[PDB]
Swiss-Prot record, chains A, C:
Keywords: Cell inner membrane, Cell membrane, Disulfide bond, Hydrolase, Membrane, Protease, Repeat, Serine protease, Signal, Stress response. It is found in: Cell inner membrane. Induction: By heat shock. Transcriptionally up-regulated by sigma-E factor and the Cpx two-component signal transduction pathway. Its main location: membrane. DegP is indispensable for bacterial survival at temperatures above 42 degrees Celsius, however is also able to digest its natural substrates in a reducing environment at temperatures as low as 20 degrees Celsius. The chain holds residues 251 to 474 of 474 of the full protein. GO terms for molecular function: identical protein binding; peptidase activity; serine-type endopeptidase activity; serine-type peptidase activity. This is Periplasmic serine endoprotease DegP. Residues 30-121, 127-216 form the PDZ domain. It comes from Escherichia coli (strain K12). Substrate binds at residues 2-6, 41-45. Belongs to the peptidase S1C family. One of its GO terms (cellular component) is periplasmic space.
Amino acid sequence: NTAILAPDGGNIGIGFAIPSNMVKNLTSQMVEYGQVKRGELGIMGTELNSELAKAMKVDAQRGAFVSQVLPNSSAAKAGIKAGDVITSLNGKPISSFAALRAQVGTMPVGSKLTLGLLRDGKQVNVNLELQQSSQNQVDSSSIFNGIEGAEMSNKGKDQGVVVNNVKTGTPAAQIGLKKGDVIIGANQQAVKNIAELRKVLDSKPSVLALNIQRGDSTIYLLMQ
Amino acid sequence: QMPSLAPMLEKVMPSVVSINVEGSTQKFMALGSGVIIDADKGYVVTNNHVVDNATVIKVQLSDGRKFDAKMVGKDPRSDIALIQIQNPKNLTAIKMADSDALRVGDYTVAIGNPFGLGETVTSGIVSALGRSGLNAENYENFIQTDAAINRGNAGGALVNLNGELIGINTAILAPDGGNIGIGFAIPSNMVKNLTSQMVEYGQVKRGELGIMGTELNSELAKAMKVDAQRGAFVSQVLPNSSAAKAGIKAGDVITSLNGKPISSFAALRAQVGTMPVGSKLTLGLLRDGKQVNVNLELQQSSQNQVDSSSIFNGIEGAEMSNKGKDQGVVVNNVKTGTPAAQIGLKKGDVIIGANQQAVKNIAELRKVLDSKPSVLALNIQRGDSTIYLLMQ
Amino acid sequence: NTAILAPDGGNIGIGFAIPSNMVKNLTSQMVEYGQVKRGELGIMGTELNSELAKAMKVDAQRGAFVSQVLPNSSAAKAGIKAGDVITSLNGKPISSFAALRAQVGTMPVGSKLTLGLLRDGKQVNVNLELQQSSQNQVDSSSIFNGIEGAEMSNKGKDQGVVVNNVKTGTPAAQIGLKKGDVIIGANQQAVKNIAELRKVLDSKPSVLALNIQRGDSTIYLLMQ
């Protein structure tokens, strides 16, 4: 259970809950890495309402309308063309674009799926492989609790935490935290990903000794 | 192996629809629900307060499809309006249940569009029968339910476990516009009468018994020495009324309508106030401790209905209504500064056609207007003369 | 009839009308394309008054004085040099520069004409072929009626509408309209030029589904 439509903070008969299949994906991911590695198909879309369906001559009042596919994206390689209507994900019919998004947006990079297409009145079946992305996640604040600054995320296999983009007046960058750094350990403990990093911080040291790598050099950032 | 309303709902949901309205009286948008009553013709029932004063009404099915609908009937007193989907294709109608057989302990599921979120189904039980008093001038014999009902739900369905329609959700007691466990719906037997009437005429031809009454409470029953704490107390019968001819005398307690016991005066009113002129009914009386059975024939009336505004949408002025058999629309009473009378509309006129089309009653008249001409050429009859009133 | 010199909006005996030969050109063009494809000679000019004619030693008190010809322009190739006086277009004497402009500015790209020149007291006759141009025409507002934004125009043969230059805060660019786009269809109808595009819009759809091409990709822009 997550939220409720409700004027005057009082239940009115309308409540919402994230379905369990999403919890089972998003969750297992977190267990094994500390964050969710988001995969994308690489298509731009929009809800396929009845009006747009007339303009586009498609017998379907619901589904995901493909506005355009990105170059060198999974969808591109699979053969999805703009002006396509996605109507089903893995056998399952697709309520709308929002669901389709939430569905794959919950799957891990590399998952093998199959989309049900509808181009020019003809049914279509394609096989895709979720790929990388540019997911805006885990900010230096979600792991440091208060240290505004560059965003962070895992890196390749368990290769350590990477600092995405450092702002400017953000406290994190105010301790030598520069974008491009790769936290590979902390307080004499190896950091393969965000989970482990949060483990060292869990013990609550007085001084956090970050062992990051800038270019071809090993350096150390201190904290308190 | 798990009990569920799913199976019944898979069949019934296509029958319910969401309604979007655009009007003016100042521009406004409103939203509610409706129930498909006849698949072939695309008739959709709904609260009159949802589509009232609407310049444009669009119906959206559960599958996504959108259609445009035009009005065909609307009765403010009972709050039931009947619209019709233009170009109905592959619809599902709901089958109606007999609301007189509902009992308080019964289960109910309500279907509709709360806050435009979409087709929402919520459930509960019949909390009470015969509630009335919300708006003392209207006809009300509401079914009360605790299935969640909020804004958007009006015009939606209230069905029993078998999927049959028992009512149309209309209103909710509720401080701070939020459901609290108390919702009301017009029972289905009323919808089936008020509705069929509208289909065949454009308005409801109201019949009256011709008696003055009041709720028969315990106090009045002592003063009047009657063993009954509920029922309709006859204050006086009108001269030359149906009740008069039947033999009903003042100081009578009506206790049953057609075999069915009568909760109160309000119900009795709502019951017959929903039947068409000429219907044959039988009342259960109680005069001076003795039971009585009488046969009545609902007669004419002076029902204040269909104003020149409900058919012209904005043309204030004289009220209108059918006339005898399909003889055309009659203009009841023209006001003074009302726009309608400001185009030559005088009381006593009998619109017998429009734009070279015959007008037998309000339905047909609303048909010519439906096409939306630039100039409406009314062919009315004043006294022994045929005249023409122009509009734009 | 187009306009009238007249103080206090009341006819005074002076009215103006576009001549018919212009209407016959500008009009036929519009019929076959939706806009007028403007051709230019590529010369800079000015009215040749009596004063300038003395300074320039030319026996002529009226005509078009060539200030300079543009490089690689029709006039350039034809042999027109600056300091030239154009005195006639296709046999017809030329009242002034303004007329000369209006004359050719009304002819379609590719028209074959011949100019009467006057360089250093000697008469001259040259043959020209109106060429392309940079004509500022049809704005995204003349076809969308209210959609401020990039200007548009035909493209080559019936190849579709091209979006000239998108501004910034203009509503058109506020729907994904970027300069360089080539509207090649709308609502499942092919758009060869502005006329056809205005045909789809004529039916007045609820949602306009533009099928444009950005670089080597086909995309779709939605409207309402």
